[PDB]
């Protein structure tokens, strides 16, 4: 079926939970043996969210190459994403090592450091120009260059230096700051505006390594971001845009990381975002 009228048919019939449970039943199951080794326990935020072995990002280290991060490679859309958990106190150096090694231009953050009165990720970037951060375990230096605070999101320019080679690179930090502590946004308009700002920066384009995107577990809000982006790109590329099937795209993405889209409300919000986004494109 088309998307907008399939949408109204699920709303009128109140069957979002049943649709979402079908997706959970059909989703791929692949091994995640490296994630579950005992030496990696303090590298995982949640015991039930792990990268598959076949698609995990490897650190370029011979001691321990493990990080909780997955490469989502969308063949028809010609787009790639790295989805990862919010960094932990003992993995902030690994996180920036990955950004460096994978040649990423942009980092997309969809959570606040504290939500619901608890810490959802480490404070992993510097908040003042004159107070830079050094990650001694991976030999990287990170400096805040500029910050632009808007009503729904903040964009930061950062300098990452590899202290071993003295090479430097400019990284863009795109921070969506207004996702509610509970539920999903009422309108997709600010989320879509944010997605378009990431696109306009070049951070999603083939002349760079894959964008790094995260929330707390790296599957819920993060899944919504890449699902909406890929569906809109396919609607622009195909002769028949009404052939794009958001449930089929989500199942394709779940071949590369488990659990993408965590609730039926996140599934409905993803439909809403693609539907409204397709009107603005034209
Ligand atoms: C031994 O070094 C460690 C540092 C931090 C942690 C974590 N702190 C916050 C919550 C969670 S979940 C998984 C690891 C953590 C664990 C080990």
PDB file of C-alpha atoms in Angstrom, residues 92 95-96 99 107 123-135 139-145 157-163 169-173:
ATOM      1  CA  UNK A  92      35.018   8.374  25.273  1.00  0.00           C
ATOM      2  CA  UNK A  95      34.494   6.976  20.420  1.00  0.00           C
ATOM      3  CA  UNK A  96      36.815   9.684  19.065  1.00  0.00           C
ATOM      4  CA  UNK A  99      35.468   9.085  14.381  1.00  0.00           C
ATOM      5  CA  UNK A 107      28.440  13.460  14.736  1.00  0.00           C
ATOM      6  CA  UNK A 123      30.085  14.759  28.665  1.00  0.00           C
ATOM      7  CA  UNK A 124      32.362  13.792  25.779  1.00  0.00           C
ATOM      8  CA  UNK A 125      33.079  17.184  24.121  1.00  0.00           C
ATOM      9  CA  UNK A 126      34.466  20.455  25.550  1.00  0.00           C
ATOM     10  CA  UNK A 127      32.102  23.216  26.634  1.00  0.00           C
ATOM     11  CA  UNK A 128      34.583  26.152  26.570  1.00  0.00           C
ATOM     12  CA  UNK A 129      37.083  27.172  23.861  1.00  0.00           C
ATOM     13  CA  UNK A 130      39.946  27.594  26.321  1.00  0.00           C
ATOM     14  CA  UNK A 131      39.376  24.193  28.090  1.00  0.00           C
ATOM     15  CA  UNK A 132      40.291  21.501  25.551  1.00  0.00           C
ATOM     16  CA  UNK A 133      40.091  17.729  26.179  1.00  0.00           C
ATOM     17  CA  UNK A 134      42.906  15.189  25.881  1.00  0.00           C
ATOM     18  CA  UNK A 135      42.144  11.452  25.580  1.00  0.00           C
ATOM     19  CA  UNK A 139      46.249   9.981  21.914  1.00  0.00           C
ATOM     20  CA  UNK A 140      43.694  12.520  20.622  1.00  0.00           C
ATOM     21  CA  UNK A 141      43.042  16.184  21.415  1.00  0.00           C
ATOM     22  CA  UNK A 142      39.612  17.813  21.006  1.00  0.00           C
ATOM     23  CA  UNK A 143      38.946  21.597  20.977  1.00  0.00           C
ATOM     24  CA  UNK A 144      35.701  23.592  20.806  1.00  0.00           C
ATOM     25  CA  UNK A 145      36.024  26.105  17.914  1.00  0.00           C
ATOM     26  CA  UNK A 157      32.520  23.171  15.237  1.00  0.00           C
ATOM     27  CA  UNK A 158      35.231  20.965  16.788  1.00  0.00           C
ATOM     28  CA  UNK A 159      38.925  20.357  15.995  1.00  0.00           C
ATOM     29  CA  UNK A 160      40.169  16.784  16.417  1.00  0.00           C
ATOM     30  CA  UNK A 161      43.970  16.339  16.438  1.00  0.00           C
ATOM     31  CA  UNK A 162      45.793  13.027  16.158  1.00  0.00           C
ATOM     32  CA  UNK A 163      48.670  13.724  18.572  1.00  0.00           C
ATOM     33  CA  UNK A 169      40.411  17.677  11.113  1.00  0.00           C
ATOM     34  CA  UNK A 170      37.249  19.725  11.491  1.00  0.00           C
ATOM     35  CA  UNK A 171      34.266  17.767  12.932  1.00  0.00           C
ATOM     36  CA  UNK A 172      30.682  19.112  12.988  1.00  0.00           C
ATOM     37  CA  UNK A 173      28.535  18.241  16.093  1.00  0.00           C
TER      38      UNK A 173
END
